[PDB]
Every structure is written in C-alpha cells, then in structure tokens.
Design a protein around this ligand. Sequence first.
Ligand code: CLA
Ligand code: CLA
Ligand code: CLA
Ligand code: CLA
Ligand code: HEC
Ligand SMILES: CC1=C(/C=C/C(C)=C/C=C/C(C)=C/C=C/C=C(C)/C=C/C=C(C)/C=C/C2=C(C)CCCC2(C)C)C(C)(C)CCC1
Ligand SMILES: CC1=C(/C=C/C(C)=C/C=C/C(C)=C/C=C/C=C(C)/C=C/C=C(C)/C=C/C2=C(C)CCCC2(C)C)C(C)(C)CCC1
Ligand SMILES: CC1=C(/C=C/C(C)=C/C=C/C(C)=C/C=C/C=C(C)/C=C/C=C(C)/C=C/C2=C(C)CCCC2(C)C)C(C)(C)CCC1
Ligand SMILES: CCCCCCCCCCCCCCCCCC(=O)O
Ligand code: OEX
Ligand SMILES: [Cl-]
Ligand SMILES: [Cl-]
Lengths: 137, 82, 334, 36, 341, 34, 442
Amino acid sequence: AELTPEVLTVPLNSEGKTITLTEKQYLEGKRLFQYACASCHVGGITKTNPSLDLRTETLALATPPRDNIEGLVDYMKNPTTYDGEQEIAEVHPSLRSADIFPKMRNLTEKDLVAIAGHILVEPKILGDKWGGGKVYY
Amino acid sequence: GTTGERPFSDIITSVRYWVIHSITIPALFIAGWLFVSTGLAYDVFGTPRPDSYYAQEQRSIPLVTDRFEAKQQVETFLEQLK
Amino acid sequence: ANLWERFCNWVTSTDNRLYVGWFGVIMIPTLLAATICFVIAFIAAPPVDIDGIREPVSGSLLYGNNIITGAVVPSSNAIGLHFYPIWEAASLDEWLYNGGPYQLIIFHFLLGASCYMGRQWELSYRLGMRPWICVAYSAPLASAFAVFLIYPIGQGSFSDGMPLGISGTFNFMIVFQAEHNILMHPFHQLGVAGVFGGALFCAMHGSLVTSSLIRETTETESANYGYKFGQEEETYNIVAAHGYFGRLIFQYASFNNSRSLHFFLAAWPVVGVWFTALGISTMAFNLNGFNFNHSVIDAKGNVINTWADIINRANLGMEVMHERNAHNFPLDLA
Amino acid sequence: METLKITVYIVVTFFVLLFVFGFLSGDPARNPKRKD
Amino acid sequence: RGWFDILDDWLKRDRFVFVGWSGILLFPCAYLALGGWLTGTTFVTSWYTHGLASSYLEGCNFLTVAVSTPANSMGHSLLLLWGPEAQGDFTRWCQLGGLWTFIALHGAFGLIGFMLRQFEIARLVGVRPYNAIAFSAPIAVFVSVFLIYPLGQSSWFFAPSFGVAAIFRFLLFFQGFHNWTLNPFHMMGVAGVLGGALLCAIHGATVENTLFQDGEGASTFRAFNPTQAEETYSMVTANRFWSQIFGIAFSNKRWLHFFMLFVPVTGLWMSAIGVVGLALNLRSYDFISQEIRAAEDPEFETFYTKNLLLNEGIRAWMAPQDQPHENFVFPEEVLPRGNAL
Amino acid sequence: SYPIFTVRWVAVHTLAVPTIFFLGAIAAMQFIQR
Amino acid sequence: GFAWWAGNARLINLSGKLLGAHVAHAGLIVFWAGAMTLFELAHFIPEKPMYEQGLILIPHIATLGWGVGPGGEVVDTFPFFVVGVVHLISSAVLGFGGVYHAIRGPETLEEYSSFFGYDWKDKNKMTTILGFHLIVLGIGALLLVAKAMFFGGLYDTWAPGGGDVRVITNPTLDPRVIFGYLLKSPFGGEGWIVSVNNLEDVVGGHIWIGLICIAGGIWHILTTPFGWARRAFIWSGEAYLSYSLGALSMMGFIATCFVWFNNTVYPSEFYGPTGPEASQAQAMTFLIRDQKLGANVGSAQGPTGLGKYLMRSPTGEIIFGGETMRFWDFRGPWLEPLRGPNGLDLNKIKNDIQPWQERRAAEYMTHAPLGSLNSVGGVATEINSVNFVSPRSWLATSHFVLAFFFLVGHLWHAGRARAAAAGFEKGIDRESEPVLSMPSLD
Ligand code: CLA
Ligand code: CLA
Ligand code: CLA
Ligand code: CLA
Ligand code: HEC
Ligand SMILES: CC1=C(/C=C/C(C)=C/C=C/C(C)=C/C=C/C=C(C)/C=C/C=C(C)/C=C/C2=C(C)CCCC2(C)C)C(C)(C)CCC1
Ligand SMILES: CC1=C(/C=C/C(C)=C/C=C/C(C)=C/C=C/C=C(C)/C=C/C=C(C)/C=C/C2=C(C)CCCC2(C)C)C(C)(C)CCC1
Ligand SMILES: CC1=C(/C=C/C(C)=C/C=C/C(C)=C/C=C/C=C(C)/C=C/C=C(C)/C=C/C2=C(C)CCCC2(C)C)C(C)(C)CCC1
Ligand SMILES: CCCCCCCCCCCCCCCCCC(=O)O
Ligand code: OEX
Ligand SMILES: [Cl-]
Ligand SMILES: [Cl-]
C-alpha cells in the first residue's frame, strides 16, 4: 500500500470542498503534532480527558464541526468545548493562548493546516487504532 | 605450542596481506551493498518491499492457511497487489 | 587481661567454630530477629492489605496457604515509605493488618546481610587471606537491596517491593515486566548472560578438572578418595585439560594459567549480576527497557508488527489485570 | 508500646557502641602478620 | 594401511582447528545452522507465517529480528526444500518458514557432531569424557524445547522462533498459558542455573583470595607455572575460612569440581522434563484446593490467585495477534480488565 | 616457511567473506526510506 | 610490580607524575562542563520546557538565578554561553598544567620542595593538605551564599506568583533548624535532608558548612591525629583513596534521592515533575475534570469503599485517592494553595482551583518521569510518538550506578589497603601459613 493522493484528500470545510495534501505536508503535520500535541494526544486519544478523542466520527459530532481543515484550524486558534458553549483557551494550547502555551508561538498558518491535515489523514491509514487506545496497540 | 600455520599477527602486519585485502574487503562490502541497493535481495528471498505488505484498501494479513496449496496461496496474494 | 580486652579477643578469635567479629556483633542479632519473625509470620500471620485498598491478602500456612503460595506480604500502600515499627501501631492487631512484619524482616535482613559481607572481609584479614571474596558477595547483596529497598524507594512504597514468598516472587516479576519491559532492558540481558554463562562455566570447569584427575584409586572406590585434604600436589593435570579444551575449540581459547581461569570464573557471574542489580535499581527510577512498539510501518503508514509488538500485547494483559481494584485513573504512574 | 520502643533503642544503641568501640580497639593490629 | 586408515590419519592431524571424523558431521551442520540464522535475520520476513517483519532488510534491529516458525498450517512438516510445500522454489521455501526447520534440524545434528567431537578429542588425548557428558544437558534442553515441545502441540508454529525478542515472547507465552513458573521442574532448573552461577563466582573468588605468594609482583597471575606440581592456593585456609563464615566448607577438591559439573547439568535436565510435560499441556497450572476455597469464598486471596488473573490478562490480550491463524476476534467488552486501566 | 592455503585458511574465509558481504548489505539498509 | 591494566598504581609514590594525573583529570571534568553546556545551548529552544529537551547543566545554572525570570521563562541565554565558555577555556589551563607535570615536570616533588612534596605516611603533612582543601571547600560553599544574598539571588519555585528569582535576606541561622534536618529520619514524610523546602534553609546551611569547613581546615593544619585515630586507621595512599570512595559513594546515593524527591533546589519548572508530583497531578486532573461535570468529589465512594478522589492518610490528613495514596507526603507550589490544616481542603477544592493550577497538573501528569531507554515517553506499553525521558530519571539512574560502583571501589581498595599494610596482599607465605599454626576447629 502507499500514501496515495486519495488518502491525502480530506474535507476542507462543511460545505463539502476538499483539499489534497502533499506527502511533505502530511509528514510535516505529523512532526508538528508530535512537537505540540502528542504529549496529550498520542495515538489520537486524549490522556487528560479520555472521553474525547480525535477520531473523525467524534469530530463530526463536535459543535462547530471539527471534521475538516477549517474546523480544526479554528480549534487551534480558539478551542471550545465539544458543544461549542465555552472557550477553553485558558487550559488548551491555542494561538489565542500562546502566552501560556509557548510551543504555539512559532506556529504559522500553514503549520496549522499541516497539523489539521495529519489529524484527518491518520484514521484513514490506521483505522480503529487511531483514537482507540491500548486495546488496539 | 604451534601446529605449523603462519601466525596471525605475522599475516595481518604483512604488506602482501594488506595488498590483497584492501581490494577483497571493500569489494565484498560493495557487493553486499549492491545486493540490497539493486533490490535483488527482496526478490531472491521474497521479502515484502515497504509498499507491498498490503493491498491499498486492505488490512488483512496474507496468511498461509493451507499446507499443500501454501505456495499457490502466496502467489495469489502477490498477484492481489499487481 | 583487661575485661574489655578479653571480650575483644573473644570477638575476633580465630578459634571460634563460627567466627563472630565486630560485623557479627550486629549480624547475629539482626539476622535472628528477621529469621524468627519470618518463620512465625510465614506460619501464622493473618492477611495483609498490601495495596492499601482494604483487600487483605492471605500469605501464611494457617490461613490456607501451602509452601509454594505462602508469603510474608509487603506492607500497605497506605504506609508508602513511612517507617512502621511495632511501637507506631495502636496494637499488634493493627500492625499485622498493615504488613508491619515485612518491614521488620527486610530491614533487619538487609542490615544483617550487609554485615555478612563485612564479616567476610574481617575473617579474611584475621586469617592472612586476600580480601575480595566479600566483593563477589556484593553482587547478590546488591540484588537484594534492589528488590527490597531501592525499587520501593523509587516507586514510593514498600508495597511494590518483592514479597517474601515463592508465588509472590513471581507476581513481582510479572508486574515488573509490564511496568518496565525488563526483558528488553540490556542490563537484565547481561544478568541472564552472567547467570547462563556462570552455569555454563561452572559445568565447563567442573567437567574439565574432573576429566583430568590423575589415577589414584581403583574401579571399586570413589575417585574422590584420590585427593587428601591439604596435600601439596595438584590432584588433576591442567596441561592434559588445556590440551583437550584447546583442541575442542582452538589453542588460544583455552586457559593454561589457573590464576587467570579462576579469576575469570569469579569475574563473569559477579559482573553480569552487578548489572542486573543495577537494572532493577534504575528501573526503580523508570528508565525502562527498549520500546519498539510500532517502530516498523509500511509506505502507507500501516503498522507492521514485530515480535516487540507481540511482547507489548502480553505486557498489556499484565498491566490491565494487576492490582485490579487499585487504580481509579487511567495511568499507572507508579 | 513505649516500653518496647525504649527497650529497642537501648538494645540497638548498646550493639552499635560495641561495634564502634570494637573497631576503635586497635583493629588493624588484629592480624596474623605485622601488628601495628 | 588402506584408504580408511589414511583418511583417519588426515582427519586426526594436529592442526589449528582439529577436524576428526566428527568434523564431517559437525562443521557443515553448525555452519549451515549459523548461516541460516544470519541469512534469515538479515533478509527474510515472517509476513506470510506470522504477520510480522523480522529482518534487518525490513526495519528490524538486533533485538527484534528472528527466523520465525512456519505457519500453524504446516503442521509438523519437515518443510524440505524439495518437498511438497515449497516444491524446490527457494523463495517460497523462505516465505513458508523453511529456514526454521533448516536451522532446527541442522542445529540438532550439529549438536550431535559437537558432542561426538568431545568424545573424539577426549579419546585421542587420553582424558575422561566428562565434558561430553556435561554437554548432554544442553542437548536435552534443545531437543525438549525446540523439537519435542512443538511435536506435542499442533505445529512448529508454537516452537520458539530464533530471535531475541521472539524468545522473550516465548517466556511470556509459557507464563500466561502454561503457568510455567509454578512448575517444580522449572524451579529445580532455576536452582541449578543459579546454583551453578553461585558456585562459579564463589569458587573463582575463593581460589583468587587464598593464593600462595609465589612471586614478588602485585599481579599474582604471573606467579603461576602451568607445569608446577604444587597447588596454587591453600585448600586448608579456604576450608577454615568457609567453615567459620558459613559453617560448612568443601574439603575435597575432587568432590568440589564434580559438584560444579553436577549442579547445572542436573538443573537443566530437570527443566527439560517439565517442558516434555508441557508438550502435552500437562501443566502445573493450578492448586485444586485453592480454587475450591476461592470459588466458595470471595474474600480468600493469595499471590497464587493474583498471578492467575495476570495469566488471564496475557492470554486474552496476546492471543489474537500471536495466533493469527485462529482468527480470534475479542470485542472490547470481553477483554478482562481491572479498574481504570 | 609456511603454507598459504590450509584448513585454517578455509575456516577463516568461510566465516570472514560473507560477514563483510552481509555488513555491506546491512549498511545499504540504513538508507532505505519507506 | 604492576601490570599494564593496574598501570596507574605505579603512580603511588611518584608525587609529581601523580599531580599531573589529578590535574589533567580535573581538566577533563572542566572540559565536559564547558562542552556540554555549549552543546545544550546550541540545541536549546526556549519555546519548549527544558525537561522536554535533554538538559541537565542549563537547569543547574537557571536554578542559581541566571538567565531566567518569573515562572522559569528563559529571558537571556548569554549567562549560559558564558558559563560554558569559561569552563571550556579553563580546561586548557588545567590540561597544560596536567600534562606538564605528568610528562615533563619533576617525577617526584619531595626533592624539589619540602612544601609540595608529601609522603602518604606523614600523618601531619596529610592532615595539612586536607585542611587546605577543607578551606577551599568552605569558600566554595560561601560563594553560593554570596550569590543568594548579594549577587542576584536564586530561583525560588515557591515564590508567590509562579516562581521567580529572589534575593535571600534572612538565611536560617538557627542550629535547631539547620542541624535538625540532619536528625530527621530518612523515611516517608521525613526525608532527612532531602526534605529541605525553602531557600532560607538552603542558604543558612551553606553558611554553617562554610564556617565549619574553614574551622576544620584550620584545625587540621594545626593538629596532628590523636592516638586513638592513629590506631584506628591505615595510613597509606590506597587507604586514603578508599575512604574518599566510601564518601563519594554515600554522596552519590544522597544525590540520587535528592533529584528524585526534591522539587525546591531541583525546581520542577526546569527538571520536570517528580514521580510523586506527576502521580498527584493525575489525581488532580481527573478530580478537576470530574467536578466540572458535576461530581461531588468528596462524597464519591470508589470501588474499594475508599474515596475515588479523596481519602484519609493513616494519620487523618485528607489526601488524593487511588494508588497515589502512597504519595501524600508530596508538597508543591501548585498544590499547597489547596491545603488547609487537615490536608486538602474540600471548600477550596470546590471553589478556588485556578486555570493555572489545572494547566500545571495536566502538564506534570503528561510529563511523569517514566520513559524507555531509547526515549519513548510514558508507560512501558506506550506506542512510539513522544520523545521524552525526564532529566530526573537520567540523573537518578546515572548517579545510582556511579554510587554503586564507588561502593564496590571502596571495598576493593579498603580490603587491599588492609592486606598490603599487613603484608599479605600478594598471597599466603607457604612457609608461614597462619591457619597451619592454629588449632583445628574440631
Ligand atoms: C584520566 C586518565 C588518565 C590519566 C590522566 C593518566 C595519567 C598517567 N598515567 Mg595512566 N592509564 C589510564 C588513564 C590515565 N592515566 C588508563 C585508562 C590506562 C589503561 C589503558 C592507563 C595505563 C597506564 C600505564 C600502563 C602507565 C600509566 C602511566 C601514567 C603516567 C605517565 C604517562 C606517561 O609517561 O606516558 C607517556 C605518554 C605519552 C608520551 C603519549 C602522549 C600523552 C599526552 C599527554 C596526550 C595528551 C593529549 C592532549 C590532547 C594534549 C593537550 C595539550 C594542551 C593542554 C597543551 C600519567 C601520570 C605510566 C606510569 O605510571 O608511569 C610510572 C604507566 O606506566 N597509565
Ligand atoms: C593543585 C594543582 C597544582 C599543584 C599542586 C602544583 C604544584 C606545583 N607546580 Mg604546577 N601547575 C598547575 C597546577 C598545580 N601545580 C597548573 C594548573 C599549571 C598550568 C597553569 C601548572 C604549571 C606549572 C609549571 C609550568 C611549573 C609548575 C611547578 C610547580 C611546583 C612549584 C610551584 C611554585 O613555585 O609556584 C608557587 C605558586 C605560584 C606562583 C602560584 C601563584 C598563585 C596562583 C596562580 C593563583 C591561585 C589559583 C586559584 C586558587 C584557582 C584558579 C582560578 C580559577 C578557579 C578561575 C609545584 C610542585 C614548577 C616545577 O615543577 O618546577 C620545575 C614549574 O616549572 N607548575
Ligand atoms: C556537605 C554538605 C552539603 C550539603 C548537604 C549540600 C546540599 C546542597 N547543595 Mg551545597 N555545597 C557544599 C556542601 C553541601 N551542599 C560545599 C562544600 C560546596 C562548595 C563546594 C557547595 C556548593 C554548592 C553550590 C554551588 C550549589 C550547592 C547546591 C546544593 C543543593 C543541591 C545539590 C545537591 O543535591 O547536593 C546534595 C548534597 C550532597 C550529595 C552532599 C552530602 C554530604 C554528606 C551529608 C556528608 C558527607 C560527609 C563526608 C563523608 C566527610 C566525612 C568526614 C569524616 C571525618 C566523618 C543541596 C541542598 C546547589 C544549590 O543549593 O542550588 C541552590 C548549588 O547550586 N552547593
Ligand atoms: C573531608 C572532611 C574531613 C575529613 C576527611 C577529616 C578527617 C579526620 N578528622 Mg576532621 N574535621 C573536619 C573534616 C574532616 N576531617 C571538619 C570540617 C571539622 C570541624 C568540625 C573536623 C573536626 C575534627 C576534630 C575536632 C577531630 C577531627 C579528627 C579527624 C581524624 C579522625 C577522623 C575520625 O575518627 O572520623 C571517624 C569518626 C568517628 C569515629 C565518629 C563520628 C561520629 C558521627 C557524627 C556519627 C554519624 C554517623 C551517621 C551514619 C552519618 C549520618 C549523619 C549524622 C550526623 C546524622 C581524621 C584525620 C580527629 C583528630 O585526630 O583530630 C586531630 C579529631 O579529634 N576532625
Ligand atoms: C496540539 C496543537 C494539539 C491539538 C491540534 C489538539 N490538542 Fe487537545 N485536548 C485536551 C483536552 C483536555 C481536550 C478536551 C477539551 C474539552 O472539550 O474539555 C482536548 C481536545 C482537543 C480536540 C477536540 C476533540 C474532539 O473530539 O472534539 C482537538 C481537535 C484537540 N484537542 C487538538 C488536552 C490537550 C493537551 C494537554 C495539555 C494538549 C497538549 C493538547 N490537547 C494539544 C493539542
Ligand atoms: C542458508 C542457506 C544456505 C547457506 C547460507 C550460509 C552458509 C550463509 C552464511 C552467512 C554468513 C556467514 C553470514 C555472516 C554475517 C555476519 C555478520 C552480519 C556479522 C556482523 C557482526 C557485527 C555487527 C559485529 C559487530 C560488533 C559489535 C556490534 C560489538 C562488538 C564488536 C563487533 C565488531 C563484534 C545455502 C547456501 C546452503 C542454501 C540454503 C539456504
Ligand atoms: C596525562 C596522560 C593522559 C591524559 C591526558 C589528559 C586527560 C589531558 C588533558 C588535557 C585537556 C583537558 C585539554 C584541554 C584542551 C582544551 C582546549 C584546547 C580548549 C580550547 C578552547 C577553544 C579553542 C575555544 C574556542 C571557542 C570559543 C572561545 C567560543 C565558543 C566556540 C569555541 C569553542 C570555538 C593519557 C591518559 C591520554 C595518557 C597518559 C598521560
Ligand atoms: C548545607 C546544607 C544543609 C546543612 C548541612 C549540614 C550542616 C551538614 C552536616 C553533615 C555532617 C555533619 C556530616 C557528618 C557525617 C559523618 C560521617 C559520615 C561519619 C563517618 C564515620 C565513619 C566512617 C566511622 C568509621 C569508623 C568506625 C565507626 C569505627 C572505627 C573505625 C572507623 C573510623 C572506620 C541543610 C541540610 C540544612 C540544607 C541544605 C544545605
Ligand atoms: C547427509 C545429508 C546431506 C543431504 C544434504 C542435502 C543436499 C543438498 C540439497 C539441495 C536440494 C536442492 C533441490 C531443490 C530442487 C527440487 C525440485 C523439486 O521439488 O522436484
Ligand atoms: O502497587 Mn504494586 O503496582 Ca507499581 O504501578 Mn501502580 O503501583 Mn501498583 O500499580 Mn502497577
Ligand atoms: Cl497483582
Ligand atoms: Cl489511581
């Protein structure tokens, strides 16, 4: 198998438009995920709140839907709770809160797209493993 | 306590020794290298290349499940990627 | 002829059937205390709440154990690394419930064993010997410090130290493998090499010497009677032994110097065991064995499992089951 | 319990002092060759 | 003085590497077993038998490479290259697990050759054959573990695979499935191996610390001559030392050295027997009296009950991946799990 | 005066020759990328 | 009489070459201090916490006040560069003196100068060299005080407002406090000297030890050992080495425990959370998360009948539940705002947990000091992804190993010194075998 453009093609927005990531993007998003996110989100789970994972199906039910590049980019700038009701920048890394989460300081707009794209691609490769936890290791 | 062979420390301090073996040693290293770099090793031994463990939309292991058709089973798996 | 000099002369006397000495002044009492408490606890102690969850574990023969399953159970997780002598309990009933005997035994035993090592130096000095037998014994002793003290220090609790039991020993090593992947730790690997190799070299040396005993007896008597205690001549023929072994491999892979050979016999197991003691002692601080989990992936990013991943599956089954009522939160951080 | 604690403290101190004073009583000299 | 005696002369000549009649069996088979292992760990996969990468070529390192066992579907096939599974196709032979039987069988015959070599050299040199006798313990372990054990089970698949981590996996299998640590034949083996290591360290240390002063130098090694008739260390001082430290001591150098042979060899023979039992799943798994009480009494808990829950974690969590041919599917809700974890 | 080619010589090259060839192959291997 | 592999034993009575060795070796030590710091700085990235980055020297410097500001934010890296450079340069000076004395200088010193020359058996001269070095060391300890009190202060994790550099103006002089640490039990909730939890006590102890070291340095230059001391010890170079090996061993073990438990002089902002700290932090994290969902964390009975979130310690104190019950002796700046007199105060817990404390607990929980030898972070069953091993695990394990081997070295050389001193380190005299002149045991 290989990392074809189909696997690299992910929704850009709710309206249904899509975008095809380069492999360079995917690899760069993976590295930036490790740098900024994996300490809590290794494998697509959430160590500090296991009830919420990064599986595409969970993100699609989030309010603002997050199963797309735009949703995820926005989340990294102004994260909300799953129902959208409250902003949580104060305890979740985001550009809005890079003062207190300094790893977010050096992140450009295209970095966020890479991070977002990796999150959306990875369950297409690993399936159940991504966000499934130790049961699938 | 010797049996009449030339001492090892005699041999590898010798000029004839190194004159022959500065050729033979790199040449083998290089052969070994090319055995892999050409991809021959994969074909000789049947080892999957990184892109041929699975079909694209597939995550089943191509597991041999028969004793006397095992050889055909593997071939059936190999063609399932071409 | 002064009263204190008389005592000092009895303490260090080389004419006592067992040597006492100054290290022994500490060793005799502390080993007696440990031994007596252990024998009584192994037979009759009631169940001990090892993990502090009010889930008492039966370890003694009288409460339904046999020789293989019995243990003196580690002291309660609720105590941690706090000191729990008898006089800190409201009653002996309380001290028994919380695992006090385990603390008494291991602290006396570690002291007494440490003095055992010193006693070995000490009599070597009084007898005009060379000093380093005690250095060989430091390998086992360091190993006992690891599983009884160092590992409990690093994890925060004597409740995770090795039980004084046969099956408790096994529990310890299973749970160690899931929390530390010790098998994949090179210092455990070296200890296996010290211990397999020590047994190998034990057999080698005993068979090579035994192979080259000089005829001194008839077929109808043990050849052992061909050696007499304190004879000055060697009882085997090391040149015959060297001649066999060097042809079995090749000449320069065999010792012809007895002093080097016996030094090698001493060095190999002692050092592999040092490392394995060091292995336990550093996993006490969670510098764990190699982790190759999902290290091989294919061109798409599928995981390609290796035998390390299979190990991990086993390790998971040990992790999720151990101390099954003791975790409320997702990570077993200690 | 305090009686027991007292006793252990006294027993232990006694043995530790034997040990210290024992080794301060010319221990290097208690060997079979050169005593000094 | 015909051809057999001429060949004998030549096989038995004193050269850097002695050959003998035994060398005809030993040297090919040992070379091939070693060769097969290095070849497979460098170039050969386990994708089609195990679903595993297992060579350097594939990404594995020294700890995770292995020549893995054939697939369970091969049964106990000899998996000859010219046999009916591979049909002379070297490539398919490799992918089917052919190198495992290749190594095991040549290894077996190499061990026979090696032990014959100990017999042959001992006879030519005039010693007694106790080193050959001591080597039976390695042979018994190898045959019991690598050949007898899978022969009682369904296939070679369940034999140990030749690799560092694969063997680690073998140890863990035997805990979860066979409860092998509870086996008194394993326990005597452990006592033999540890007893031998102790004997080794304690005997070397003793000799080195009861040396006679036979030279002026601070390196005491020099002060030995291999031809001297005199014992190089005091058996009498050693005996007094140990009698007074430990209560008993050896007094007979011949018994001492025979004991060093006896202990590790006996220990390994004992464990071989236990493994024979495990070929049949004749395990020391349970204590019936404990299970009867524990079933009736939910407050009864021993280290024995605690380890069986560990064994049960191992079986359910490891079997789908470790036995792919069984197509085990365990949904999350069936996996045994403590709280939180 | 020593012979060149011996039994010893054969045993040595029997092991030495594929060792290096195998070392070459494994060295190339560190540059494979998925 | 020594072999190449015991070759340095040849230097025992060559006081000039032995100076070369000691001084050359000091230069390697200064070199490594220098080079490692420059390496750490070349790799350092300030957006990242130090403990995500493999640093062990930079955190020692930061802890002394240099280069950091409020909360441990790195403000200025130039102090780091300076420390490495100066150490580095200084190692060439030590290297030069070192190889000069070992190769070209006078082989022995005692002919060239009665002052620098020494005989190991000169109990007076040995105590004078010891006394000089004590004084040096006393000066060493005062330099720390001087920094704390006159040249900038020290990093105080406990400073209100997140931690900050703070000048120490009332160092603790009370001997009941200073020497009282020396008398606390090493066991749980006591921790002997590892429990020291404020810079006032740290700085006052160094005043004491500075003076005590100068006093004793002075004492030992003016005295010779009394007769009981003369008869208790072996007087030889190898015996002196063995004494110092014992002490370095003991000291290494102490350091191991220091870096594992102490979050005051090993601030967690820099070194990562302690094991107890991280474990406590997880219980905090899920207490916070669950209370936000509506759980009443004080009345929640867990599966064992013990509280799921909160329980009592054996002496009554309200503490976190689950396995971290073992870790209730932990104290840290993010947690103490919740402690009332009876332990964790349930009304503060319901009302006064701050975002910054939620952040800190999550961060410490997810940076617990568990990791693989190839630096995969987390429990041993975790997948690859996070490249992390806590500085505290690196520093604890390394120094436990060195402490261990230095105890073995102490036994080696102490035993050998005793035997050489008595004349049987080379073996038993065949013609005078002590045992053959004793009666038999039976
Ligand atoms: C920190 C490590 C260390 C140090 C400082 C020393 C120091 C010393 N050793 Mg020991 N030794 C060591 C490790 C060390 N050794 C180890 C590991 C071994 C085992 C292999 C030995 C084995 C050993 C033996 C067998 C002997 C010594 C001897 C000596 C002394 C004399 C050396 C001599 O004449 O050589 C001469 C060597 C040279 C002329 C070669 C060049 C060496 C120079 C110094 C290299 C420096 C390079 C450096 C980059 C220069 C920078 C210069 C700049 C700062 C100006 C010297 C004091 C000898 C002794 O005791 O004499 C009585 C001796 O017999 N040593
Ligand atoms: C503790 C280490 C040490 C010791 C004990 C000695 C001892 C000695 N040296 Mg060596 N030496 C050392 C280090 C050491 N040196 C270093 C580091 C270098 C290179 C810089 C040298 C280079 C050297 C040479 C080139 C020669 C000697 C000579 C001598 C002898 C005569 C000393 C004399 O007359 O000066 C009296 C003392 C002084 C002039 C010192 C002045 C005050 C000093 C410089 C300041 C104090 C330093 C301070 C405490 C710490 C450094 C600061 C740093 C922390 C930033 C004496 C045996 C001579 C010899 O063997 O005779 C042929 C000789 O020719 N030495
Ligand atoms: C001897 C007592 C002593 C103690 C307990 C400490 C303790 C401490 N020091 Mg201080 N320090 C000392 C001496 C001491 N230091 C001296 C002499 C100097 C000058 C060389 C310094 C210079 C210094 C600096 C520059 C810094 C510290 C730092 C620290 C702290 C962290 C380092 C650490 O964990 O070391 C743990 C301590 C030890 C391993 C020493 C234990 C010694 C044992 C208890 C006694 C051994 C006795 C010995 C065997 C001799 C016996 C003689 C015999 C006749 C009986 C820690 C609180 C750091 C700090 O405070 O940061 C703010 C720091 O940056 N210290
Ligand atoms: C490196 C540090 C060092 C070293 C190596 C020495 C070495 C020596 N000192 Mg000096 N000393 C030092 C520092 C040092 N001193 C300092 C700083 C002072 C000032 C207080 C002194 C004050 C001093 C005096 C006043 C005397 C010595 C004496 C001696 C000699 C005998 C030592 C002895 O018997 O110890 C062995 C120690 C004992 C037998 C008893 C020690 C009891 C301790 C407190 C028990 C603690 C044990 C416990 C496990 C450790 C944990 C810590 C504990 C306190 C809680 C010896 C040459 C004696 C001598 O001959 O002087 C001429 C003497 O009378 N020293
Ligand atoms: C690195 C920049 C990242 C990225 C891209 C994300 N995270 Fe986190 N995460 C954490 C917690 C506690 C939650 C739940 C918050 C809540 O709802 O209360 C989250 C949630 C997310 C989501 C949404 C998941 C969903 O199903 O909607 C996403 C897309 C996300 N995160 C991305 C905890 C942490 C961390 C602990 C300190 C850190 C670090 C990160 N997250 C980092 C990142
Ligand atoms: C199988 C087979 C066969 C055979 C084969 C063979 C015979 C092979 C061989 C091969 C070989 C023969 C190989 C080898 C290789 C080797 C190697 C690969 C090695 C390596 C090593 C190393 C790596 C080392 C290193 C080191 C270290 C690491 C440390 C210490 C030091 C040293 C240096 C040692 C045939 C043909 C019959 C056919 C069928 C099949
Ligand atoms: C004796 C001896 C020995 C040893 C020796 C020694 C150990 C030495 C030392 C030495 C040393 C110890 C050295 C040092 C050196 C150093 C140097 C020489 C440095 C320099 C520096 C520089 C040049 C700098 C620069 C810089 C800067 C300034 C900035 C930053 C960057 C840089 C880094 C570039 C031996 C064993 C071998 C042998 C025998 C004898
Ligand atoms: C700084 C500081 C501090 C303080 C400290 C101190 C003040 C110290 C002290 C310490 C000390 C003060 C110590 C001591 C020690 C001692 C010892 C270590 C001892 C030794 C001993 C011995 C070794 C002995 C021996 C012997 C015997 C017993 C018998 C006879 C013989 C002999 C001699 C061998 C604190 C913590 C607050 C905080 C932080 C900082
Ligand atoms: C004493 C025992 C020696 C036997 C060694 C085995 C001989 C070497 C075997 C070489 C076999 C290659 C033949 C494979 C091709 C067979 C084609 C087919 O299946 O019909
Ligand atoms: O105690 Mn015995 O065990 Ca070492 O982790 Mn946590 O804690 Mn419990 O859990 Mn897994
Ligand atoms: Cl358990
Ligand atoms: Cl928990």
